[PDB]
């Protein structure tokens, strides 16, 4: 639950990193059984 | 929780068919729950352990057991891409209208996931 | 609508797999919680 | 050349984002002809 | 040492392609400049 | 810079074979440089325009022209994965020991890039 700060040069770099940051933080709301089900599916494809 | 329940959750999840049968015969809690509400059937369904899935259903496993997020074994199997397990669950009366607390039915997860074979079976079963 | 990506570097593959996972699984999150979360980002 | 700040929750999220941020900023040092040569190569593979 | 990645989502493919590119092309940068750059990151 | 030089840089880069031949016959600066030091030969080599590469070399193009980063047409072709162009450059005396200002020779970029066919030709040509 500890908070880190990144400094980013360039608007396009900020946009890319904000998109990924949002995906990583929102992914944490997904119940683990759905995450593990997704990972089973990934294992099946690879 | 129970000791045999925890062993059965673990055996069902990692796919130890023999340990599952031993635990069942010893009266292991077939509807034991892990910390997310998962039953042995959730875990075996999720992890594609078809033999363990059939054993559990024949030995009193709730086919429509609801974990802490309202997901059923059918949700997990459908999301994971385990077609054979989806069919077995349906045979034993798995509820295709079961909504988790985010309002998803199994079809929604299969369709979102691109598990087209399973999506089609669930729509047709609607 | 399924594209394929080539990655040289086991380390790079693992990073891109993590981000693939997060980009995909974030789609499951109810819009209200996404919207709540974005209204929160206005911090900075 | 404008500077943006991201706040990140969780050490593992910070590590992932710092790695990507570093790659995006360092990539900017690579002369465009090498970037365009790399992109030609990508076009050939896909 | 070449792994393959599957991506559903044209938008997600483009993002992962951008990061693939940056992860790979950053390898070309002389260590001294990488090291310089990391010694700079100590800002925060 | 020169007007015809800029047109030749653009034609060579986007692969307009005919416009290249017209510009050359009109005395277009075959060693014109864009803002990174690229000559028409750099751009055609980079973008895999083999016919334009041959035309340029026959009409006085410096095979070992060095851009602002010390990259030669052989660096770019080798990095891009254009084997046929690498061979033509080598025939016209492309310098396999040419180091850019980061100390890379063409082989280094081919090898790093995984252009194994080109890496092998460059090593053997060392
Ligand atoms: Co933008
Ligand atoms: Co870590």
Author numbering:
A (entry chain A), D (entry chain A): 352 to 397
B (entry chain C), F (entry chain C): 1 to 126
C (entry chain B), E (entry chain B): 353 to 396
Reproduce, without paraphrasing, sentences from the article in which this PDB structure was first reported.
For this purpose, the OD of p73 (aa 351–398 of TAp73α) was titrated with DARPin 1800, yielding a dissociation constant of 94.5 nM. Titration of DARPin 1800 with the ODs of p53 and p63 as well as with the p632/p732 heteroOD did not reveal any binding. A detailed analysis of this interaction demonstrated that the interface of DARPin 1800 includes stretches of helix 1 and helix 2 forming multiple hydrophobic contacts as well as some hydrogen bonds. The high selectivity of DARPin 1800 towards the p73 OD, despite the high sequence identity with the other family members, can be explained by direct contact with non-conserved residues within the p73 OD including L380, P384 and L385. While DARPin 1800 detected all C-terminal isoforms, DARPin B9 is a highly specific binder for the α-isoform, being the only one containing the entire SAM domain. Interestingly, the DARPin 1800 seems to have a stabilizing effect on ΔNp73α as the transfection of this DARPin resulted in a higher cellular concentration of ΔNp73α. Presumably this effect is due to stabilizing the tetrameric state of the p73, making its proteasomal degradation by endogenous ligases less efficient.
Here we describe the characterization of two DARPins generated against the oligomerization domain and the SAM domain of the transcription factor p73, a member of the p53 protein family. DARPins are based on the Ankyrin repeat fold consisting of two antiparallel helices, connected by a loop to the next unit. For further structural understanding of the interaction of the DARPins with their target domains, we solved the X-ray crystal structure of both DARPins in complex with their respective target domains.
